Design an enzyme around this catalytic site. Sequence first.
Site, PDB file in Angstrom:
ATOM      1  N   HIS A  48       2.269  18.614-108.403  1.00 43.17           N
ATOM      2  CA  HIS A  48       3.581  17.991-108.520  1.00 43.17           C
ATOM      3  C   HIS A  48       3.646  16.619-107.889  1.00 43.17           C
ATOM      4  O   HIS A  48       4.445  15.763-108.311  1.00 43.17           O
ATOM      5  CB  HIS A  48       4.653  18.919-107.900  1.00 43.17           C
ATOM      6  CG  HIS A  48       4.862  20.158-108.770  1.00 43.17           C
ATOM      7  ND1 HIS A  48       5.981  20.999-108.731  1.00 43.17           N
ATOM      8  CD2 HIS A  48       3.940  20.646-109.709  1.00 43.17           C
ATOM      9  CE1 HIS A  48       5.715  21.971-109.632  1.00 43.17           C
ATOM     10  NE2 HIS A  48       4.554  21.800-110.202  1.00 43.17           N
ATOM     11  N   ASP A  49       2.844  16.371-106.862  1.00 41.90           N
ATOM     12  CA  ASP A  49       2.792  15.048-106.270  1.00 41.90           C
ATOM     13  C   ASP A  49       1.997  14.105-107.180  1.00 41.90           C
ATOM     14  O   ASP A  49       2.529  13.044-107.544  1.00 41.90           O
ATOM     15  CB  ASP A  49       2.118  15.065-104.902  1.00 41.90           C
ATOM     16  CG  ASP A  49       1.998  13.695-104.252  1.00 41.90           C
ATOM     17  OD1 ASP A  49       2.852  12.834-104.474  1.00 41.90           O
ATOM     18  OD2 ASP A  49       1.046  13.476-103.509  1.00 41.90           O
ATOM     19  N   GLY A  67       1.515   8.387-108.458  1.00 45.10           N
ATOM     20  CA  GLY A  67       0.468   9.381-108.511  1.00 45.10           C
ATOM     21  C   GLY A  67       0.329  10.123-107.206  1.00 45.10           C
ATOM     22  O   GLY A  67       1.345  10.513-106.609  1.00 45.10           O
ATOM     23  N   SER A  71       4.493  11.097-102.210  1.00 47.92           N
ATOM     24  CA  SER A  71       5.898  10.756-102.326  1.00 47.92           C
ATOM     25  C   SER A  71       6.711  12.027-102.304  1.00 47.92           C
ATOM     26  O   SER A  71       7.864  11.944-101.899  1.00 47.92           O
ATOM     27  CB  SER A  71       6.179  10.008-103.619  1.00 47.92           C
ATOM     28  OG  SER A  71       5.872  10.767-104.797  1.00 47.92           O
ATOM     29  N   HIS A 176      -4.181  28.733-111.517  1.00 48.11           N
ATOM     30  CA  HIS A 176      -3.295  29.871-111.669  1.00 48.11           C
ATOM     31  C   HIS A 176      -4.036  31.188-111.448  1.00 48.11           C
ATOM     32  O   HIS A 176      -3.474  32.286-111.580  1.00 48.11           O
ATOM     33  CB  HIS A 176      -2.643  29.872-113.050  1.00 48.11           C
ATOM     34  CG  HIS A 176      -1.421  28.973-113.218  1.00 48.11           C
ATOM     35  ND1 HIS A 176      -0.533  29.059-114.270  1.00 48.11           N
ATOM     36  CD2 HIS A 176      -0.987  28.013-112.303  1.00 48.11           C
ATOM     37  CE1 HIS A 176       0.447  28.190-113.969  1.00 48.11           C
ATOM     38  NE2 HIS A 176       0.224  27.581-112.848  1.00 48.11           N
ATOM     39  N   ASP A 194      -2.743  36.761-112.028  1.00 46.46           N
ATOM     40  CA  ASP A 194      -3.896  37.516-112.481  1.00 46.46           C
ATOM     41  C   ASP A 194      -4.092  38.644-111.476  1.00 46.46           C
ATOM     42  O   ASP A 194      -3.374  38.688-110.470  1.00 46.46           O
ATOM     43  CB  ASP A 194      -5.186  36.662-112.615  1.00 46.46           C
ATOM     44  CG  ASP A 194      -5.983  36.133-111.432  1.00 46.46           C
ATOM     45  OD1 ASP A 194      -5.700  36.419-110.261  1.00 46.46           O
ATOM     46  OD2 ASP A 194      -6.937  35.410-111.716  1.00 46.46           O
ATOM     47  N   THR A 196      -6.449  39.087-109.288  1.00 50.03           N
ATOM     48  CA  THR A 196      -7.059  38.749-108.025  1.00 50.03           C
ATOM     49  C   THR A 196      -6.422  37.475-107.497  1.00 50.03           C
ATOM     50  O   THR A 196      -7.094  36.431-107.469  1.00 50.03           O
ATOM     51  CB  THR A 196      -8.559  38.572-108.238  1.00 50.03           C
ATOM     52  OG1 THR A 196      -8.638  37.641-109.297  1.00 50.03           O
ATOM     53  CG2 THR A 196      -9.329  39.831-108.615  1.00 50.03           C
TER      54      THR A 196
HETATM   55  C1  HEM Z   1       0.402  23.158-117.606  1.00 55.97           C
HETATM   56  C2  HEM Z   1       1.218  22.936-116.435  1.00 55.97           C
HETATM   57  C3  HEM Z   1       1.644  23.960-115.577  1.00 55.97           C
HETATM   58  C4  HEM Z   1       2.817  24.651-115.652  1.00 55.97           C
HETATM   59  C5  HEM Z   1       3.817  24.632-116.812  1.00 55.97           C
HETATM   60  C6  HEM Z   1       2.920  25.412-114.412  1.00 55.97           C
HETATM   61  C7  HEM Z   1       4.026  26.163-114.036  1.00 55.97           C
HETATM   62  C8  HEM Z   1       4.109  26.946-112.894  1.00 55.97           C
HETATM   63  C9  HEM Z   1       5.250  27.740-112.549  1.00 55.97           C
HETATM   64  C10 HEM Z   1       6.586  27.723-113.271  1.00 55.97           C
HETATM   65  C11 HEM Z   1       4.885  28.466-111.456  1.00 55.97           C
HETATM   66  C12 HEM Z   1       5.724  29.465-110.676  1.00 55.97           C
HETATM   67  C13 HEM Z   1       6.451  28.842-109.489  1.00 55.97           C
HETATM   68  C14 HEM Z   1       7.396  29.840-108.861  1.00 55.97           C
HETATM   69  O1  HEM Z   1       8.343  30.266-109.518  1.00 55.97           O
HETATM   70  O2  HEM Z   1       7.183  30.241-107.719  1.00 55.97           O
HETATM   71  C15 HEM Z   1       3.529  28.097-111.125  1.00 55.97           C
HETATM   72  C16 HEM Z   1       2.828  28.545-110.007  1.00 55.97           C
HETATM   73  C17 HEM Z   1       1.645  27.984-109.545  1.00 55.97           C
HETATM   74  N1  HEM Z   1       1.018  26.904-110.123  1.00 55.97           N
HETATM   75 FE1  HEM Z   1       1.373  26.126-111.883  1.00 55.97          FE
HETATM   76  N2  HEM Z   1       1.786  25.261-113.631  1.00 55.97           N
HETATM   77  C18 HEM Z   1       1.012  24.352-114.325  1.00 55.97           C
HETATM   78  C19 HEM Z   1      -0.127  23.729-113.802  1.00 55.97           C
HETATM   79  C20 HEM Z   1      -0.659  23.943-112.545  1.00 55.97           C
HETATM   80  C21 HEM Z   1      -1.729  23.151-111.984  1.00 55.97           C
HETATM   81  C22 HEM Z   1      -2.462  22.051-112.765  1.00 55.97           C
HETATM   82  C23 HEM Z   1      -1.916  23.604-110.706  1.00 55.97           C
HETATM   83  C24 HEM Z   1      -2.705  23.092-109.658  1.00 55.97           C
HETATM   84  C25 HEM Z   1      -4.024  22.512-109.709  1.00 55.97           C
HETATM   85  C26 HEM Z   1      -0.969  24.711-110.544  1.00 55.97           C
HETATM   86  C27 HEM Z   1      -0.915  25.550-109.445  1.00 55.97           C
HETATM   87  C28 HEM Z   1      -0.024  26.604-109.269  1.00 55.97           C
HETATM   88  C29 HEM Z   1      -0.138  27.591-108.233  1.00 55.97           C
HETATM   89  C30 HEM Z   1      -1.316  27.743-107.281  1.00 55.97           C
HETATM   90  C31 HEM Z   1       0.922  28.416-108.387  1.00 55.97           C
HETATM   91  C32 HEM Z   1       1.299  29.598-107.526  1.00 55.97           C
HETATM   92  C33 HEM Z   1       2.344  29.304-106.459  1.00 55.97           C
HETATM   93  C34 HEM Z   1       2.689  30.498-105.596  1.00 55.97           C
HETATM   94  O3  HEM Z   1       2.099  31.562-105.748  1.00 55.97           O
HETATM   95  O4  HEM Z   1       3.582  30.381-104.765  1.00 55.97           O
HETATM   96  N3  HEM Z   1      -0.182  24.882-111.652  1.00 55.97           N
HETATM   97  N4  HEM Z   1       3.073  27.124-111.990  1.00 55.97           N
HETATM   98 CA   LIG Z   2      -7.911  35.199-109.436  1.00 56.43          CA
HETATM   99 CA   LIG Z   3       3.663  11.367-106.037  1.00 58.38          CA
END
Ligand code: HEM
Ligand SMILES: [Ca+2]
Ligand SMILES: [Ca+2]
EC number: 1.11.1.7
Length: 336
Positions: A48-49, A67, A71, A176, A194, A196
Amino acid sequence: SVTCPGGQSTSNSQCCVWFDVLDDLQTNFYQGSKCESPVRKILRIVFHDAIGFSPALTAAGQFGGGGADGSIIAHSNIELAFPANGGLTDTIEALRAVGINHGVSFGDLIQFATAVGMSNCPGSPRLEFLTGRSNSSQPSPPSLIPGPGNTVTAILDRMGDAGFSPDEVVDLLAAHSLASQEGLNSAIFRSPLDSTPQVFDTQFYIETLLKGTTQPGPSLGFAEELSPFPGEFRMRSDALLARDSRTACRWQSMTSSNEVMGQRYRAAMAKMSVLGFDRNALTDCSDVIPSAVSNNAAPVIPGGLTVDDIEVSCPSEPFPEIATASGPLPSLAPAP
Ligand code: HEM
Ligand SMILES: [Ca+2]
Ligand SMILES: [Ca+2]
Ligand SMILES: *[C@@H]1O[C@H](CO)[C@@H](O[C@@H]2O[C@H](CO)[C@@H](O)[C@H](O)[C@H]2NC(C)=O)[C@H](O)[C@H]1NC(C)=O
Ligand SMILES: *[C@@H]1O[C@H](CO)[C@@H](O)[C@H](O)[C@@H]1O
């Protein structure tokens, strides 16, 4: 090359302050070097940053975003009001204090905390770490973060503007594999994406491809799809990206090898970490980052499901031979 006050050797003197913020983060932020919610929250934060970066806005005379400039912390007052940035306040404040206390830039600190957090999770690659990003930033423009309700065309366009090809979008999504949701369906708080959530592995790519069969909570939340078993949460954008013809074959290739997946992810993250910067102006301090413990488990199709349960979507390559497990359908506990 040089010896830091703690007797460690490093390539440059600029890397020596990072051994101190390493110890603080491991002891405090990560509660004894654990792979739990602070790591998953920091992974959401680095994306997000870094993604508040738009060449198109710049081209049209507007401020396009800096980027990976931190911020989201220096301007958390405006950026945490964005829809995609909910549930991050507690983590941002914790990171703010570390940054202020060690005199490091916020952009550098977020990249560092991501590399260090991932080293606590089994199976993770060692991410590159560069230091020198300026501490001054301006607020990110709104609407630059992809949403779970977005169509694939929408995500690829936003991601493409920032600089990523369809392949790198799939590679980036390996994060993810260490994930849960808290705000999409609060009724099943921390339901994992997932089986794990504490192992950086291929299970996320396998499991999002299984036929959606189960509603894990009382109702469906925002952008929620039916998942393959109780306790697992399936997000719409992940389900759609797994199946879209533009991303389906790269998604399928990520299913049988943890080694290829880690390699691809490390490379996409090195690119994301310098959005808005000239990496040739940064100092490499990757030697500060510790190795993660290895993941010795092999990829599996969980709980009695077979290849007949996966919705093969790559028309040119047959699905990889992945091992199956016996037992009934798993029910996942929330991510720690
Ligand atoms: C295609 C774009 C992506 C979308 C639409 C997306 C969307 C989301 C959403 C909606 C959540 C759930 C947040 C919540 O309700 O707690 C999530 C969790 C997460 N996303 Fe993504 N994500 C994307 C890409 C990424 C990328 C590129 C990374 C980092 C390199 C990332 C890392 C994470 C992580 C680690 C979580 C888990 C957070 C937690 O367990 O508290 N995501 N994502
Ligand atoms: Ca895993
Ligand atoms: Ca930024
Ligand atoms: C990076 O910039 C931010 C300002 O955007 C600095 O953060 C402030 O630091 C002072 C103390 O030095 C705190 O009292 C403020 O609350 C901080 N503001 C914010 C928004 O966090 C930060 O100190 C700068 N860091 C360096 C090393 O220059
Ligand atoms: C599977 O069981 C877990 C707890 O073991 C729950 O979190 C889930 O809702 C399902 O019942």
